[PDB]
Amino acid sequence: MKILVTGAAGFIGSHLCQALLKNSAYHVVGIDHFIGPTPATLKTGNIQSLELNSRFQFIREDILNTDLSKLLQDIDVVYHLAAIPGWGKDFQPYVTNNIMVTQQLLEACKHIKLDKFIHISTSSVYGEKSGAVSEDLLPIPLSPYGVTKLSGEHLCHVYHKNFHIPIVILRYFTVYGPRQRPDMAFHRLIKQMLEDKPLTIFGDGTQTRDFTYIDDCIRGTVAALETKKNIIGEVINIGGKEQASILDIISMLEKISGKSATKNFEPKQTWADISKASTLLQYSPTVSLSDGLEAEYDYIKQLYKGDAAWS
């Protein structure tokens, strides 16, 4: 079996490619152009181990400036994770990389026999919801990111209905752990704690949110390929084991580091409904925040203060 992962040098793509290659039957092609919020310097480390694997092929090209028929020959499964995640005149890159990229990939998949086109989307499509967020909820995105990613999902349905591209949509809720993007909250809090600085906190930080450890996110993503259920056409939430406030997270980080944080200071309560994923994917997130945060803490320590080839 041969699998294309778009955005394979990114946070989630780099872990997915590695989880796929544990199956000695799987061959992976990753494509990544090294753009978006993570600098290329920091990003190179994400694929260090990946490029040691003989069954991994890496292409450093823009999806919009590459031979797609060539990239897609002999591909059984596409995992599409390439995106600009996380305004003004900054808007064009979101349209180019979240809408035009998805449309051009889907166009090139018409002339191709895929088992699955697994399109990765985001909980930012939903906008604001108190309580359980389920896949039947009317999406009202409140960011440019959310708007352009939801547009990507809608193109998946257009190409499924019109040309029978076997699309699956996974909506990831906040994913954290080793390799988390530097623009994301846990990375920023941990780097501030390591540097004895004030921890930036927007609002009073008691609002509780859903968080998914990378390894739980990746098990759910792999199960989208390996499930015996018919999931073609479905939208599936992939969300976390435990929910926590930004003040709970800092509590657990102070326990981890044995430091104390100079805190520098919107539904109260929201979580992913993961019942569709439980039923269709046997998905069950198993990693605790305390284990997950320890692993992210050690990663960020080594990233900025260490001497690894990926420092």
Ligand X SMILES: NC(=O)c1ccc[n+]([C@@H]2O[C@H](COP(=O)([O-])OP(=O)(O)OC[C@H]3O[C@@H](n4cnc5c(N)ncnc54)[C@H](O)[C@@H]3O)[C@@H](O)[C@H]2O)c1
- Interaction partner, residue 27 (ligand X, its own copies, none; CB < 5-8 Å by kind): none
What are the structure tokens assigned to 277, written together? 């994923």
Subset of residues 151 to 180 that bind its own copies, contact rule: CB under 8 A: 151, 154-155, 157-158, 161-162
Q: Which of 26, 126, 145, 299 is catalytic?
A: 145
Shortest reach from residue 145's CB to its own copies, in Å: 10
Q: Does 33 bind ligand X (CB under 6 A)?
A: yes
Contact in structure between 225 and 186 (CB atoms under 8 Å): no
Name the one range near its own copies by CB under 8 A: 75-83, 87-95, 201-209, 245-253: 87-95
Q: Which residue has the tokens 């309580």?
A: 131
Nearer to its own copies, 23 or 143 (CB): 143
- According to DSSP, the residues that pair with 28 across neighbouring strands are 3, 56
- Interaction partner, residue 87 (ligand X, its own copies, none; CB < 5-8 Å by kind): its own copies
CA dist., res. 191 & res. 246, Å (int): 15
Q: Does 247 bind its own copies (CB under 8 A)?
A: no
Of 28, 50, 81, 300, the one binding ligand X by CB under 6 A: 81
- According to DSSP, the residues that pair with 6 across neighbouring strands are 31, 80
Q: Does 55 bind its own copies (CB under 8 A)?
A: no
DSSP strands (E only) in the chain: 2-6, 27-31, 56-59, 77-80, 116-122, 131-133, 167-172, 175-176, 199-200, 209-210, 212-213, 235-238, 243-244, 263-264, 270-272
The footprint of its own copies (CB under 8 A) covers: 87-89, 91-92, 95, 99-100, 103, 107, 127-128, 136, 138, 140-144, 146-148, 150-151, 154-155, 157-158, 161-162
